[PDB]
Design a protein around this ligand. Structure first.
Ligand SMILES: CCCCCCCCOCCOCCOCCOCCO
Ligand SMILES: CCCCCCCCOCCOCCOCCOCCO
Ligand SMILES: CCCCCCCCOCCOCCOCCOCCO
Ligand SMILES: CCCCCCCCOCCOCCOCCOCCO
Ligand SMILES: [Ca+2]
Ligand SMILES: [Ca+2]
Ligand SMILES: [Ca+2]
Ligand SMILES: [Cl-]
Lengths: 411, 411, 411
């Protein structure tokens, strides 16, 4: 039989998922998703006793529902079946947003989404080069999380720049049950913004007033290995070392406010790219207590051996996918990332078996390969070496090694 | 390329979601949903200390899958990603049902669905005029909840009336682990049943035998502000006052049975509509205990400034959507609702800090505006004023104010 | 309007769900699901006091997403909304897998799937003849569960046989946080493998090293009645007897290893089929403790009164659906299953109120009828009679009776 429509002409597409769209741009629907299956093995600092643990789990398992109605109104609902983002009271959302669009070039986004701070975070988790995002997000995780609901405005400006800003109602309350309000700004100058020709300078700022609020400020980096503690399958369990670098449990009235500044750069030329982000955080303490300070950076270099550039999008100021040219071979990509963090918490005044008085430091070397078999499937492996200072596992190790592999299917 | 089918002719449709159906009425599939993002601020009675709290949350985030097979067999599975209906044992279902239509005009529905009691409850939550349903459902929660599994028969009768009835296995057990069985009946005479031309008179009854059964009978109305306590994001937390009007926790053998009678009326002429429901509840006590009695009503006036009538459907005896006439400006609707409830629990014999001996009373005034931007998008604001008698917050407040806004997207 | 595509020609299908596929076999998407609504009533051994309990619940409520990309890469994501498989840490997955078929006839499967042990488990839960799978799986539930992540290879061999093997990272850890590794093998010789013409002989083996691991080894068969303890609705709650036949809670260091051997057969002559499985399990104990041993079998006879054979698939070595010949009548099927299990746990050295020293035994007789209304809808009733030895409920009953009905809708 035939397949017709009552309304405007429709075009349908499938690469394993589904797209249906009217040709007049008025209405559309997209059903997609991503599955990331990880297996990692790790030892030393990463585990409590320093022996090898493992983790087999889905890093992400999203079902993704998006569409357009009446040209200017869009929605996106991405739900994480692996339970690695969200919780069972707010919901396991990667995203639940509505966007208008009508004030083009200015876009207005409402709902649950990650606030815009950082190039690596802006980049789709399908296409982040490394298997895990950088260490600096571990020391300031509120700046670009989606743990709340808000409103964002964004615009490409003068065809060479991108600006975003939001107010976000966090799921942290003050003593009156009034939510902590988070403010974000991000501005990117990107005078070259094509795949294989990117020059990117970004500045970003986040602020929240913490007065009379109960907020968890414990900084507990996994140090580049997800499997020390993760949902989606299994992890190192009771032998996983997720060490406390500094900060406190959610006790009301410990802090005044929390501020983060970030500077970022990226340069892409053909198959080569370099990117780096630096951030500085200060949590101002209340009455007699000491401030919590944290800073860090990462630098990443990447090279597609098969020649294809990483996609770049000025709208969002973010990298994206690699589309393989050779349909049999696929695309092959090598990368290296260096990460370095420092946490200052002078509230820590006595030594322990795992924490020495002074600044906790962490650094990682990540070396990896991505095989893009095609636009649906990506197979990856990362070697990670961690080194810490003034923090260790219970065994006294200040270094650890890990190897993680991932099978990714997107539709 | 071409798009064809190997069965009967298919028609496809998208307005943000997806519909695929054979033109012989034999098979169909519909994927849709609804996202309701709320932000509320509220004080006085609504909070424990009387100060202003807020709540940013999804009221609902449904993914909706429905279809038809072999003409006469329908299914509908609606899942709440916002976690506001259901739980993590029974499932977060808005609906999971199978309908057989072969005995048309009689329909048979099986599974998890809300039992049919009340016009406002029968009305789709997409199209309920106010941001929250009326206070009388707070005093008789069980009469129209979906907290169980059952069988329902319903029919339009003589083109002028609607009847439904169900037996429902509640998720409440007696001492033998046998489920409380819930019985529902509803009958509506609607001699006029078209948009802008409605005369609706309804009677409804609900009964359950509670002998040796553990059932939560606590009546804890939110008093017209969802944000005092809700899933889907954040709420007033430890400062949210959800006051106990009466009733008891789930203990086996406190009660003999539970009966509810309801009367309802609705009238529409063009863009104006009025609707009202009254209910009376008695829970018969065992032993030397006193009965639990509750009664209440609401009345709602609504008017579409732009002239469009509310849709009305005789099948279900329910109001429905407003379709905007003007594609540029959309439709604008004003409404007022008055709610009034009374709870009599003579088991309460001593005063407490928030509850006086005697009948607890609550009334609200709700004033609101809906902008239907188009058939996908509705933006709303409600102002709510509450007044209680013999119940207060910890601050001794018996009045509260709230302002709540919603962005809704349906597909 | 028209419906077109910009890639290869597409065929779309709906029977309540959706399929979309390119005619060159390169890309496809399939959205489907299954809803199984059960109502059971049961007494005697099945309940703690021997009185009648009930259970109204969804046995399964899967949404099913599957597809193909670039010909050789397949995914399948099945999520259980009824909460009866998986958990809220690993996810409620029936399946989350990627299959590479490039090495055809050898298929490679990655992710979360049931390990391949047993004909009745290989059979889709849509088409399992009885409402609940056999008792032998209750005594060795790890051999074919999906509580972990792994890799499986499988192949039809020489047009007359099927072989599968896997390694599976279990969600059980040793003291180092290294997962218990499960190994499976299954081989089936099926020289006749067509509907109504089946001769099936299979051998299967499962092994896991449990050294220094914490694993729940409690054997707690429901004895043929799901309703004693289930998610998806309601169950017998505090009056549900799920008796402990033997084994221990997850204490690290109790066991050395766990081995299961299985033998199976199936025979089909037109509308008649017979199938049986036998298994034996030994959990070797550490240090001064006694081994846990379990063994059992089931035998099932099935006959389609209306004449249609059960489908059989050599790829997977499994039975499948019945496709009704009479559009009006549908298909009618009768079956009888006998199940018999024995659990030997010599660590039990003193009598209790519910358990006598010696081998715990259980046997069931299941008699049932299936009405396949059409290919989407199946209505079922099973009568179950249980008999136990050396184990009872608190009332002292060693026999129980149950009647369960199901409405199933598949799309
Ligand atoms: C101190 C300011 C805090 C404000 C935080 C608000 C976060 C709540 O976001 C929920 C979104 O719902 C808002 C509803 O308004 C929709 C308006 O849409 C109009 C589009 O043209
Ligand atoms: C000796 C009489 C025992 C029977 C007492 C039960 C009377 C009440 O019956 C209510 C049955 O509830 C039906 C619930 O079924 C819901 C599941 O729907 C799926 C149908 O297979
Ligand atoms: C192709 C990328 C790998 C990621 C796929 C996710 C599946 C994770 O499963 C973990 C595999 O565990 C197997 C480890 O077992 C160790 C012994 O292996 C012996 C195999 O004969
Ligand atoms: C034609 C197909 C070949 C079938 C061979 C399969 C044989 C394995 O079946 C497993 C069932 O074993 C049951 C053994 O239990 C013994 C029954 O004792 C009853 C004595 O009266
Ligand atoms: Ca029950
Ligand atoms: Ca709040
Ligand atoms: Ca592990
Ligand atoms: Cl879910």
């Amino acid at each position: 039989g035939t397949v017709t429509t009552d309304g405007a002409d429709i075009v349908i597409k499938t690469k394993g998922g589904l797209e249906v769209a009217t040709t007049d741009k008025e209405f559309s629907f997209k059903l997609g998703g991503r599955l990331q299956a990880d297996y990692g093995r790790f030892d030393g600092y990463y585990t409590n006793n320093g022996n090898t643990a493992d983790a087999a789990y889905f890093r992400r398992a999203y079902l993704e529902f998006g569409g357009t109605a009446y040209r200017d109104w869009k929605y996106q609902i991405n739900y994480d079946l692996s339970r690695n983002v969200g919780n069972d009271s707010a919901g396991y959302f990667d995203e639940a947003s509505v966007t208008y669009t009508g004030f083009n070039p200015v876009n207005l986004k409402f709902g649950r989404f990650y606030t815009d701070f950082g190039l690596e975070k802006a980049t789709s988790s399908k296409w982040v080069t490394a298997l895990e995002r950088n260490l600096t997000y571990d020391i300031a995780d509120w700046v670009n999380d989606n743990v709340g609901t808000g409103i964002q405005a964004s615009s490409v400006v003068g065809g060479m720049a991108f600006l975003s800003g939001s107010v976000f109602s966090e799921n942290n309350n003050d003593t009156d049950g009034d939510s902590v309000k988070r403010y974000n700004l991000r501005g990117v100058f990107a005078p070259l913004h094509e795949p294989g020709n990117v020059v990117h300078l970004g500045l970003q700022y986040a602020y929240r007033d913490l007065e009379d609020s109960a907020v968890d400020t414990r900084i507990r980096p996994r140090m580049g290995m997800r499997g020390v503690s993760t949902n989606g399958g299994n992890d190192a369990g009771s032998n996983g070392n997720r060490g406390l670098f500094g900060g406190s449990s959610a006790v009301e009235g410990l802090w005044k406010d929390d501020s983060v500044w970030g500077l970022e750069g990226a340069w892409a030329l053909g198959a080569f790219s370099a990117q780096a982000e630096y951030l500085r955080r200060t949590v101002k303490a209340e009455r007699d207590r000491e401030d919590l300070k944290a800073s860090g950076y990462y630098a990443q270099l990447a090279y597609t051996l098969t020649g294809e550039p990483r996609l770049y999008k000025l709208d969002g100021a973010k990298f994206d996918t690699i589309k393989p040219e050779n349909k049999e071979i696929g695309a092959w990509e090598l990368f290296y990332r260096y990460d370095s963090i420092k946490v200052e918490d002078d509230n820590i005044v006595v030594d322990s078996a795992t924490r020495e008085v002074g600044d906790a430091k962490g650094k990682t070397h990540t070396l990896g390969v991505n095989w893009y078999a095609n636009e649906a499937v990506k197979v990856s492996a990362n070697y990670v070496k961690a080194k810490t200072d003034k923090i260790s596992n219970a065994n006294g190790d200040d270094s650890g090694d890990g190897l993680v592999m991932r099978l990714q299917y997107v539709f």
